[PDB]
Design a protein around this ligand. Structure first.
Ligand code: HEC
Ligand code: HEC
Ligand code: HEC
Ligand code: HEC
Ligand code: HEC
Ligand code: HEC
Ligand code: HEC
Ligand code: HEC
Ligand code: HEC
Ligand code: HEC
Ligand code: HEC
Ligand code: HEC
Ligand code: HEC
Ligand code: HEC
Ligand SMILES: CCCCCCCc1cc(O)c2ccccc2[n+]1[O-]
Ligand SMILES: [Ca+2]
Ligand SMILES: [Ca+2]
Ligand SMILES: [Ca+2]
Ligand SMILES: [Ca+2]
Lengths: 494, 79, 495, 75, 50
């Protein structure tokens, strides 16, 4: 007799009513209300897992309760990012739908002048409005001031949305990132002919990576670039920053720096959210296990039919760990959670430790920079080697710190990297001492938290108060800012 | 298919020397995955689950005879 | 062609040997189990090397000489770190179970230049199924006899770690013959005769592949073997165990356990030994119930057409086809698998080497502070204690990983995490030895540590007799020059 | 108990155990009875509800619970 | 041809090793580790719904 399989499984083909350059989220809602409803789940902002969650608390704050701080924070962040915009505000990452709201609430962009002080390139991983802006300004876009687009964007309708990833006509997967396209091309891969399983990672690799901006002499001024030419590990990116850059400081010629730390005078690299580069050679990535496999797992929410979850959050919010439980159908959700925490707890604890020794390193170099006693004959050369190590240590811990998986994405790499960071920070302390003939030792004796206390409060507003810039010894390395009213409140002008 | 696999299995169990590893050949990976599709179409109608991984079992790993579970839950010595 | 259903039970085959209840001679099992025996004999292979491991018993501290003396992946500082302790005389890569007694009788760690070995009969505890008779014969009094007493009272080939150590001679049921493991099991409320199959497929190895210690005269039965597991299986637990169980009377270490005191730094030390079991239990395979047997004894059809468990206990990485792993990881290629192991191993070994460098620096810092002639800090004494304590903790921590034989593979995260902590401790020691000397020791701690404290490559019981050689390393001034004496024992022969 | 017995769910034979001890496939893919006695709203996929109400989404169900709770609490 | 439904659905019948007046939770753990692990989830004390 006949078959009863009268519906045959076929790969879905889509044809929308939308125009080829559509970017508005709300235009996608009528044709795909299911994925949209799922997309809207990103508005949830009250649930914490253990180390993560969607409460945008201050990541340097282990003091005040939620929503201001949390039991797992890094108290030393502001010290370590002295004189760099990250010392003003840096909070826990939350749902995609909040990208522009938070972008325009952050104190990192200046809101006490017309000019933001940062390039329009900050818009790069925030909005699919990036496509028109570039098509209109070309190479000239990047170097413009960030605040120049502040009021030319719909906060709800133009955040990271469907057009960031899908062709609005066919709904095929797209790479719309300029810098990612730049790498893909540099590798000989065609961004329109990419294997699916790669795409299910690369779509996120559009933004969840470590980046930098070209300086004036490195190519197109302020262009985003992924430092990936040497490979994906900390050593590889650090070696890339050895050869691509514009520093003119003796000892660091040709090297890149996001800023110089004003206490230690060390030329620093800044790392940001390197999920892609961490994931790619981690136990999961190495075996073809993909961001989408975990963060966009199939969920049977439409009757019993699969749709792709567009709720980008922690897999650990679902007590049944369903995203994991086809591949690990033999383990219980609780077993899996305990195996995640096995990595996370060690990593986070080691991070805090690696961060303390980095503060100590900066402090040692600061004392050696100012020392009035007898120096060694190789003082200058040793100060370089010292600063070189302050820079290397910080990069290594930043690499891990700034990474949102807290070890999980690449357990081995994460831990390895923190251990090396410790070695580097300490080698700096050793060198700073050698150079001062150990004369600084007496000033490095106690617990580091007494001699260099963690900086809990710092923003562009407080940096105006002369009384406040006296409360901590490291505040003397910063300038007192001029009295200014707030000029930008979100999108309106005061 | 039954007579070919049948014949080939009798031969392997008698005159041929099977290895320490028994693995599904290309052909059987194929007829199996097709039969995944045969019974679980409706769960998958709206989702390009066919294009992600080569076979369903690249996610549904344990449908492949519980390969992940400890040896002692699957196997003993011969008598 | 066939017609009854499979069984969910998974009934292990049942045996009834011709052997007596107390049979321990390996070659007695041969005629009844030729296929397992054949496999057991494959441990005799001693030429094949992997990346970090193998079966060549090279000197683990020798990255200078080629195989069989040394190897490109070795720990150059071993002898400095184990100064004044028997492990400074000889320490070789472990090899197959069939060699155990031969290698025991060849090691320079046991005194062969006197009648008395200077070490307890407990050393036999994990070398032979002769243990049972000997314990039955001398009870509590066995452990504290000298080791040399049984030296000639054993057959090197027929009484090595063979079948009787794991199998009941009559039924062939899996068995636990270890006294120290039985002690732990009993302390947990478990019945060693009534344990589930899966648990046993790990515990049988758990008989020997562990961290152990001997009771000192006031700790209970003298020289009796104990596993420090009451606090848990991790370094932190085991170290806490050793804070509370011990005999030290040294100020600031009262009640704590020590295996010896470092002659240079005067640090009461702990020795760690091969904690494969403690490492494997909460690592990603063990926590999932994948047992040593799954990997080191996977099923093989080699013989005839019938599957037996391989009794070739060696590196799973010897096999080009990784056949063992692929019973589970069937979607992965062999080379993929090798690459993921190396991922862990390269990192772990590199880090380990670093942690040992800093351990040596700590010892040197504390040594310097001990002999320091300038103005001491007001807290010199307390600081010097806190400093010694860290040298101690730091060493145990790396030792925990170094002694472990998988180079991090059994538990990647425990290994690397533990190594990182080792580092922090060792460094803390230095900082304190520096604090205590108001930094007047800095000047002696400046360069590369390999030019300050050069690796001790050579050292054995014979050489320690030569006073000229004993002037060869700064650190040799903390060891006595041994009395000129003739070799008494050569393997099993008296001279 | 006394609230539930004549409520829209109890009146129709819908039981505390039906909701607070729902079946969950946590042992391979086999059902065991949840002995986690808590809020059904902790599971973002509202799975306890989603056999009986398989045509509604978890979020739809949440909004219908809150429809009652918000009026009740305020009153 | 024959059925392939070789495992038939039956209502579980239990017989424990426990004495008739047993009240200790920890005595139930060895025979029912699954329900127990689920019972232990009640130790969670950080999650608020609305
Ligand atoms: C019942 C109808 C079945 C089914 C569905 C399968 N078998 Fe067997 N088989 C036997 C032996 C000795 C082997 C090893 C062969 C080798 O080394 O490659 C196999 C192999 C298989 C496979 C895997 C290889 C493949 O792609 O075919 C599969 C999927 C398989 N079998 C399924 C032995 C026997 C028998 C002895 C006569 C009998 C009867 C069966 N198998 C029955 C079945
Ligand atoms: C033979 C020596 C090997 C090798 C080289 C590897 N495996 Fe296994 N594996 C098994 C399980 C259950 C897990 C965890 C995932 C889960 O819970 O299902 C793993 C994990 C790994 C990894 C990744 C982890 C890491 O730290 O690197 C790797 C690289 C790995 N394995 C390699 C299951 C099994 C087995 C089932 C009983 C067997 C046998 C093996 N693995 C054997 C090996
Ligand atoms: C008659 C005896 C029944 C059959 C046959 C099935 N059920 Fe149920 N069921 C219930 C719940 C709360 C779940 C959730 C499972 C999960 O944790 O995901 C299930 C699950 C199933 C499934 C899986 C279906 C799916 O894909 O979602 C099947 C095929 C199934 N059950 C078959 C609840 C109940 C229930 C309430 C008290 C009863 C009486 C039954 N189920 C009975 C049957
Ligand atoms: C992520 C990669 C992935 C791929 C590829 C995949 N699945 Fe799934 N599958 C899942 C996930 C995740 C679920 C859980 C859905 C849920 O419960 O919300 C699931 C659920 C299912 C279920 C429901 C079973 C249950 O647990 O109740 C079936 C049936 C199924 N998939 C069939 C298939 C088939 C057939 C294929 C191949 C054509 C396939 N799947 C491919 C991940 C995958
Ligand atoms: C190449 C991609 C990329 C670039 C360029 C980029 N970001 Fe982001 N941004 C991200 C990602 C990914 C997240 C979420 C992950 C995280 O914050 O850890 C994020 C989060 C944020 C947040 C919210 C979290 C917080 O810090 O409170 C702000 C604000 C932000 N970015 C602003 C900026 C600013 C200002 C710049 C320029 C200096 C910038 N972005 C450049 C990718 C990027
Ligand atoms: C256009 C850039 C961009 C792309 C593409 C992108 N992200 Fe993000 N992601 C961000 C930014 C920016 C934030 C921070 C939003 C905020 O906090 O305001 C963020 C936040 C997140 C969060 C925080 C969620 C939470 O609730 O804590 C997760 C998880 C995440 N991204 C993962 C992903 C995944 C997975 C993908 C791929 C499917 C992806 N991102 C694609 C830029 C991007
Ligand atoms: C950061 C990337 C990203 C964003 C943003 C995103 N999606 Fe997707 N989308 C994906 C991925 C990955 C898939 C799975 C496709 C696959 O496996 O080939 C997918 C699948 C889909 C599908 C196919 C059906 C399915 O569920 O597999 C539709 C329709 C869809 N998304 C609509 C939308 C809509 C509408 C939005 C905006 C509200 C959106 N997507 C936002 C990455 C994204
Ligand atoms: C194998 C599963 C898996 C893969 C693959 C994976 N992730 Fe994760 N991700 C997790 C888990 C588990 C966590 C930790 C959740 C927690 O601790 O709350 C996490 C954490 C995160 C977070 C932090 C979530 C939060 O609450 O802020 C982000 C963002 C993220 N991953 C993005 C990515 C990106 C981008 C990729 C691809 C490069 C990726 N993930 C690949 C499972 C995965
Ligand atoms: C002859 C076989 C057969 C019979 C009879 C049958 N089912 Fe199913 N059932 C299946 C198969 C096959 C699937 C999976 C199809 C898919 O994945 O799309 C399924 C799926 C399901 C599902 C998940 C999908 C859904 O609609 O919820 C449930 C629940 C279920 N069955 C329960 C039942 C109940 C209740 C009945 C009685 C009315 C029943 N089944 C009758 C074979 C059967
Ligand atoms: C649900 C579907 C399914 C059923 C039913 C099933 N198997 Fe399998 N079988 C698989 C899958 C999946 C594989 C591995 C396919 C691959 O290598 O990609 C496999 C592989 C095998 C293999 C060798 C490959 C391996 O991984 O061991 C044998 C032998 C086999 N099947 C025989 C049987 C026999 C006999 C039965 C009946 C008792 C049976 N199968 C029932 C799905 C099934
Ligand atoms: C009676 C004690 C004892 C038991 C039981 C025991 N071991 Fe050993 N094992 C040893 C000793 C002692 C050596 C050192 C022998 C030598 O180096 O000459 C050794 C060596 C080894 C080696 C190195 C061999 C090589 O070829 O490099 C491996 C692997 C090993 N053991 C694993 C195991 C496994 C797996 C089990 C369980 C099935 C086990 N051991 C049970 C004591 C034991
Ligand atoms: C999941 C697989 C797996 C499990 C489980 C496992 N091992 Fe291994 N073992 C390995 C691998 C891989 C190596 C690395 C060998 C190499 O470097 O060549 C190794 C190394 C070793 C070695 C050193 C081998 C040599 O060449 O001398 C010993 C001894 C050992 N393991 C014993 C054990 C013991 C005891 C257990 C149980 C507590 C255990 N293993 C559990 C896979 C495993
Ligand atoms: C260090 C432990 C150890 C030693 C020594 C040992 N065995 Fe085994 N033996 C095992 C384990 C573990 C199994 C697997 C039992 C199981 O899976 O339940 C096993 C299995 C067996 C079996 C059952 C058949 C099989 O292959 O699974 C026999 C028979 C056997 N061994 C005989 C011997 C003989 C003969 C010797 C000595 C040459 C010996 N054993 C030495 C641990 C050991
Ligand atoms: C509040 C009352 C209550 C308590 C307390 C309770 N259970 Fe249950 N239990 C139930 C109910 C109701 C069922 C299923 C009803 C049925 O028979 O359909 C059940 C079912 C079970 C089953 C049958 C298997 C299953 O999953 O349905 C087992 C076994 C079980 N419980 C064990 C335990 C254990 C162990 C504990 C304590 C750790 C415990 N119960 C505590 C009410 C309870
Ligand atoms: C002339 C047809 C009658 C013979 C029936 C053979 C039965 C048979 C025997 C096998 O070993 C198999 C192995 C894999 C797949 C199918 C198999 N079938 O069908
Ligand atoms: Ca977050
Ligand atoms: Ca950067
Ligand atoms: Ca070896
Ligand atoms: Ca010991």
């Amino acid at each position: 007799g006949c078959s009863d399989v009268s519906t045959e499984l076929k790969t879905p083909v889509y044809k929308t009513k939308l125009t080829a350059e559509e970017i508005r989220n709300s235009a996608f809602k009528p044709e795909f209300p299911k994925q949209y409803a799922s997309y809207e789940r990103n508005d949830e902002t009250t649930v914490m897992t253990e180390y993560k969650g969607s409460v945008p608390f201050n990541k340097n704050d282990n003091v005040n309760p939620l929503p201001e701080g949390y039991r797992h924070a890094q108290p030393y962040l502001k010290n370590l990012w002295l004189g760099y915009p990250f010392m003003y505000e840096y909070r826990e990452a939350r749902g995609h739908t909040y990208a522009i709201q938070d972008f325009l609430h952050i104190d990192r962009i200046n809101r006490y002048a017309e000019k933001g002080g940062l390039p329009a390139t900050c818009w790069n991983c925030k909005t699919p409005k990036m496509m028109e802006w570039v098509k209109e300004s070309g190479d000239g876009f990047w170097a413009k001031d960030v605040n120049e687009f502040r009021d030319k964007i719909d906060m709800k309708d133009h955040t990271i949305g469907c057009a960031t990833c899908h062709d609005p006509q066919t709904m095929e997967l797209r790479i719309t990132s300029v810098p990612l396209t730049d790498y893909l091309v540099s590798q000989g891969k065609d961004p329109k002919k990419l294997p699916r399983n790669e795409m299910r990672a690369l779509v996120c690799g559009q933004c969840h990576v470590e980046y930098y901006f070209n300086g004036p002499t490195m190519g197109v001024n302020k262009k985003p670039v992924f430092p990936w030419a040497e490979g994906f590990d900390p050593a590889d990116m650090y070696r890339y920053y050895d050869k691509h850059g514009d520093l003119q400081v003796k000892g660091f010629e040709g090297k890149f720096a996001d800023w110089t730390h004003p206490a230690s005078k060390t030329p620093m690299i800044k790392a940001q959210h390197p999920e892609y580069e961490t994931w790619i050679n981690g136990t999961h990535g190495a075996a073809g296990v993909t961001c989408a496999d975990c963060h966009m797992s199939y969920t049977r929410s439409d009757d019993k039919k699969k749709i792709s979850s567009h709720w980008w959050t922690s897999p650990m919010k679902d007590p049944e760990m369903r995203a994991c439980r086809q591949c690990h159908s033999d383990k219980t959700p609780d077993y899996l959670k305990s195996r995640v925490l096995f990595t996370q707890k060690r990593t986070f604890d080691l991070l805090l430790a690696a961060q303390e020794v980095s503060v100590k390193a900066h402090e040692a170099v600061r004392l050696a920079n100012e020392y009035q006693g007898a120096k060694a004959a190789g003082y200058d050369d040793l100060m370089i080697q010292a600063r070189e190590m302050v820079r290397k240590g910080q990069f290594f811990w930043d690499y891990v710190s700034a990474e949102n998986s807290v070890g999980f994405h690449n357990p081995a790499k994460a831990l390895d990297t923190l251990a090396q960071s410790q070695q580097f920070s300490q080698k700096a302390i050793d060198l700073a001492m050698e150079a001062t003939q150990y004369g600084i030792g007496k000033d490095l004796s106690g617990d580091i938290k007494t001699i260099v206390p963690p900086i809990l409060k710092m923003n562009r507003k407080l940096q105006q108060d002369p009384e406040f810039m006296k409360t901590h010894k490291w505040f003397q390395y910063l300038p007192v800012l001029p009295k200014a009213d707030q000029v930008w409140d979100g999108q309106k002008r005061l | 298919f039954k007579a070919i696999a049948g014949a080939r299995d009798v031969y392997m169990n008698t005159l041929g020397h099977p290895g320490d590893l028994i693995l599904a050949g290309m052909e059987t990976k194929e007829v199996v995955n097709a039969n995944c599709k045969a019974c679980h179409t409706m769960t998958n109608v709206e989702v390009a689950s066919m294009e992600a991984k080569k076979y369903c079992t690249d996610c549904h790993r344990n449908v492949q005879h519980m390969r992940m579970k400890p040896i002692s839950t699957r196997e003993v010595a011969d008598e």
